[PDB]
Symmetry: D2
Subunit: 449 residues, 4 copies
């Protein structure tokens, strides 16, 4: 234990900890979840403190020797060497002040090892406030999770779904509407639908990026930029864009909206919620198609990990969590007051978790489920050919009444419509075998080649 102090007085701190007194106060004040900032959030805070020290150096506001020590410690934090030094709960002051101070105190302690004296709030927090730094880090983490992780993961799932659409282009089967037998489709067509749902999901994430990428940096305490250079924002963003390659990061269109609200996180959660909705439909269909092996639909076989549909269950459970996280994000989003929205840590936890779950589960689903599905091709075609649904094209030749008798007999004898029409002696007067084969071609009915 070692003694430290802040504006309010003196505080006991673990002796070998890189954090200081404000972080220690926050440890004692918020033992709520036992969970702190994620690696992506810590990395974001590191990048931002580095970019801030760079621009403060560039405007000759910060001595070069201090800027260099900050930039080196900030590199260390962005790299992941210091996660053990961020012990503050997610459920902290709603501005993220506490985690901002955590980053400043940890950076000061790293520089102190290299023999450089930094003041956490006069050097490491120079030209900044808690109010604009913690939301900036949150939007950097979210932008990076959308562009570098989620979109590529959904592109891999899209590609696995589109590959199946192609492989299964002629695998004709019974359509189902309302869960009841309908006119024919192909597994390919169904998988082209699933592929479109994920491609549309990528379009929805891309459409939110012009507002997700907005950074509050330079707005200071209330959005006015008081105590910061007038161009602090555009300079810090230019450093982050050059360092990350994330061209989507940009200065806020309005510095007050960017601090009074987190509407860009609510907007983004909407896209993730819509993806969760798409993945629920895709995973449900796939587990139903794999159902059996005797009493279910037995259309396809899932790869093993009689196989339980374990990846569909993970996907549907992840979707349920994204929906829950979405409601929490919208709740925090609505409840800002005046110059600041004080639900940032909670909203940050939820949107970053939704990004991570959808990313990881989309890759596992694509690789370990979609890629290895095998279709019961001949069985699917036999059912499609034996369905009362395909008798309609026969009504003009044999009449409604006889069409109905053919469907009833085909079902009762478990035979194809073709073999029932022959069995009933309808060939000859009503139509020829050539006519029957044209009318009952289930692949032509599916309007596939």
């Amino acid at each position: 234990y070692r003694i430290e102090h802040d504006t309010m007085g003196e505080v006991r701190v673990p002796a070998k900890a890189l954090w200081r007194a404000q972080t220690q106060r926050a440890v004692e004040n918020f033992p709520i979840s036992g969970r702190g900032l994620e690696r992506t959030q810590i990395r974001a805070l590191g990048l931002l403190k580095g970019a801030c020290a760079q621009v403060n150096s560039d405007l000759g506001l910060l001595a070069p020797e201090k800027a260099d020590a900050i930039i080196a410690a900030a590199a260390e934090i962005a790299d992941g060497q210091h996660d053990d030094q961020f012990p503050i709960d997610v459920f902290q002051t709603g501005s993220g002040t506490s985690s901002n101070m955590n980053t400043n105190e940890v950076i000061a302690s790293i520089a102190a090892k290299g023999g450089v004296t930094l003041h956490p709030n006069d050097d490491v927090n120079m030209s900044q406030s808690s109010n604009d730094t913690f939301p900036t880090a949150t939007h950097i983490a979210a932008t990076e999770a959308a562009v570098a992780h989620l979109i590529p993961a959904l592109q891999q799932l899209h590609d696995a779904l589109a590959a199946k659409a192609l492989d299964w282009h002629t695998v004709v089967k019974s359509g189902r509407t309302h869960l009841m037998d309908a006119v024919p489709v192909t597994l390919g067509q169904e998988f082209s639908g699933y592929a479109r749902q994920i491609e549309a999901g990528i379009e929805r994430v891309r459409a939110c990026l012009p507002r997700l990428g907005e950074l509050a940096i330079g707005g200071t305490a209330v959005g006015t930029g008081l105590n910061a250079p007038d161009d602090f924002g555009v300079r810090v963003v230019a450093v982050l864009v050059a360092q990350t390659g994330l061209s989507e990061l940009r200065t806020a269109a309005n510095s007050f909206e960017a601090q009074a609200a987190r509407d860009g996180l609510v907007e983004a959660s909407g896209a993730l919620r819509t993806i969760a909705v798409s993945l629920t439909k895709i995973a449900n269909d796939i587990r139903w198609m794999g159902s059996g092996p005797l009493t279910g639909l037995a259309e396809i076989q899932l790869p093993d990990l009689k196989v339980n549909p374990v990846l569909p269950e993970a996907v549907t459970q992840v979707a349920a969590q994204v929906i829950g996280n979405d409601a929490a994000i919208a709740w925090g989003g609505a409840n800002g007051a005046f110059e600041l929205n004080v639900y940032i840590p909670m909203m940050a936890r939820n949107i970053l978790e939704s990004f991570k779950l959808l990313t990881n589960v989309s890759r596992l689903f694509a690789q370990r489920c979609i890629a290895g599905l095998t279709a019961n091709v001949e069985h699917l075609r036999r059912l499609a050919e034996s369905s009362p649904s395909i008798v309609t094209p026969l009504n003009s030749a044999i009449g409604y009444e006889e069409a109905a008798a053919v469907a009833k007999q085909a079902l009762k004898e478990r035979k194809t419509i073709r073999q029932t029409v022959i069995d009933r002696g309808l060939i000859g007067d009503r139509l020829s075998i050539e006519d029957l084969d044209r009318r009952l071609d289930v692949l032509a009915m599916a309007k596939a080649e």
Copy 2:
């Protein structure tokens, strides 16, 4: 009190009604909510039936006499002349087939009044299925609601907020963070923030239009187009765009996705929910600013309709409704199976209600609350003159070190920056009283 014949018995229908037997069976099957389709949904079904008859006539599949009569009846339906011939509950067969058949039967009856006999299914439902029609009318209605009603209403609200941001550009007041006294801002700056939130809301709606506008029409029963002309979708969409002026209506990118899912309504509801979140923050700040006149902030006076903030209460209640509607839409969205999402009538009721509530309340908020707000300028300035100050704007007069000493002593002795500079005997050749006041001026601190 006319009696009709159904293939499972007899059906008594009201004599003034234009619907027939299938619609009456649906009236009897689903007495759940006692609410039917809204005007918007009736209109879109009319628009769709007129367009389908036009293309069926153009392809020579439908005798022009019959097409003409369908087109005439459909135009009446689209023009709101029959909003009382659609008695089927919202909570019906999940394809919306019942409401589809309701539209077919009303058109048949209207045509019969002008001497033309139409079969509801073979003529009025020609080239269509029971599964591609109701989702098409739903996306027509939602696209029209977004483009012709919501976006203009939000633009009216944006423009009222932006007008106030300009009026109040130099109306200094105290900032509040965590509800606690903060450095100065202007009422103008806060309104510029509100205006940007509504502008971002319009951008959010605009961004969903490429998917909201996708129509299933031509996909038929399962998305394959069986029993429809190969170009039915593209030709119908072209007629609908021509008649409505809605360039946002488009053929589905994937005919299977367009019927297996309603992801477009889920996406759109997300934009409306975000708008509802923005509107809550704006309405809440405005009622708080008008709070009192004695026990509140008393920053502004709302127009009187001791004024209760009735329009902020209507806005926040609408917002709550849009959040609930949004949960219902997503729930229906997720629960499709194979070739058909069967939550369409419930998802339609919820998205179209969210569009209508946000449109109506945004116009009312803009016109009957925002436009008439008056600022208590002298009160606001007195709050600004009570905000914390910073020593930074003294740096050039006393130096980092003295300024640092001023901040420390102000904090320790719980004094203002201004009084601490005076008490330390800093007034003199280096800093006059005029200079200290100009350096710490509250409007300058707001950096307007």
Copy 3:
């Protein structure tokens, strides 16, 4: 099109409208949804005004002739005679003061026609405020909906599920876990699970009644009872109980909690949301059981209204709406300030609609779906007797290696496990035909009563 004079100016009021100037201004101020109060809310406002006039008369505060006029007018409103006289939008002032005034004006106008002059405020609103009346009417309406309408409807559905569970006691079929074939159950056992879900739903509704039936009446503007008799609450409640027979109605435990919050509505919506969850599971299984007639499960046939499962679709759509309404109620619930929660009309619309939809859809589901279901008995037994899941009790006789071979051949050749064991020549000293029959007794494996 008759004319009324208002302080603000003249106001035109429709001819056969019983409302006055304040209601007309509200119609002009809030054109938002075009939907007004529901029949239950209007009846509750009538009930409350009658009981308030009865008590003001009993205490000597109101002339008997004025009290008699109010009680007669209020009875007509509570009888559903004036549902067209409440034109104000749900999205009105959040206390519901506009609707309270609407009731006062309608009563004054009904009394005017009988030669009695009532001041809407001074007489019909005597001892009441603008804030304790509308929530009192909401809680009366909700308590009545729960006790008189929803519980009976749920009891009807319970008894239909229980009746099917009894009729299907020995209808052995293949269990399903993860949608995959599992050891046997009966249709009866599954229906007994659905019955319990609905019985537990009735328990959930009964459990919230102690707080749902709490009435704010007598609290006046802020909960203190200023401007009302000290015993007004207990007196009006005693009249409402004696008149309606709703013993669940009670004074609020705390007069400030009853006006500052609508927590009892949020609690009740949670019970309705749980029922919506139970109904989703029941309706989804039932439509899945009736899927076919060829490519689906084909366990049961639903009665007509190849039959589409239209009532399970109505049920699952109602469940979605109840879930959405539940989210709106909680949102309004959380957002009260100080002495008053100003989301009452929105919360009232959503709770009373959830009660109505569940009541109506439960009765339709019980009568037109559940009562008429018919099981494919012989077919269910044949699949149960043909399932690889049931070979485990052969292990002690022929070994788990030979038992796996029997399972694989039964499935490939679409034969019963019994016929496959015989076909493979396993009958003999290690296994008698009677021993095989005991081992593969699928109904015994289900362990029904």
Copy 4:
């Protein structure tokens, strides 16, 4: 590291790991959240495995030396000694079978260190299945969180709010409706409302326990009890109640409902969501009451807990109401996830258990922890600005009403007008208009304008 053999080949496992092959496959199959079971779930799985081995011994199905070794290992898990041996993701197979096998394997590995061979499946999973175990452990954990932790934390907040209600019994202030000035109340009355909200919240938790405490144990794979003793459920329950003292644990009313659905978790989340709604109203009113101290309401002062700002050095923030409102938001989100998993079961099994368990147990923990912090570090230390509140109440136009019968509603309205315009008290404005006289004495006025009497405190 150390090699093992599954029936799908060879698996590598951390050396100082007590889990075996199947847990390591699950670690490889499901890298989704990087978050595993919580301490309460692990303890519950320990309690259940020990109760099952006791009953299997009692019924003579499991050799006493095997049962004692499971009981000893299961007690180590329930005591929290092996909280690092459960690496499987929450986002696993929907039954919880992976986490069930994790428990069986860690128990087998603990017993091997003492010279006893346990087959994870045949001995540690005896009479149980892959489907009635995990939901049993979830309901144990959730019942224990409700009765042992949340209800006492709520009672502590209730008691802190009630003590303020009593201390502020006579602290008169203006009421606020629609955020506008209203007739007088006391700060004590408002706090009595907050107290009643938390008390009702405890009633709401109590009312769910008869169904939250229902255990699936003994139902086996599909709810029929096949491969288990007919009375396995009542016997395991009898042991769990005797050992834990948790009287709320009971065998399910219907064995199919208990595995096909998790409606008890949905029901309990509704109670927690209602508490989150109450806490939102209480915390929002409290931060507003403490707002300012110069530009806000300044009704009360919150105890200081850390510095708020560097730019504005002396600024102190309502950090505990902020933590409470954020926890509330998380409970509402978690509640939507639980209901979604709840509705989506199929036939004999609801396969959303691990996700529903994570969300309900977290809601219980956040509400417990934040309720105690709120009671101790915020409510207990609140101070009222008594003179400020009384001044506003004595100057309120709302209090002129009881002058009606003495001077007329018109003259009363002029007193309000004048007092409001000239920033004076109603009592002084009435004197300043020469109203004191024959029909209104100076003590009659003091009696009529008694603002505490107008609050009507019991």
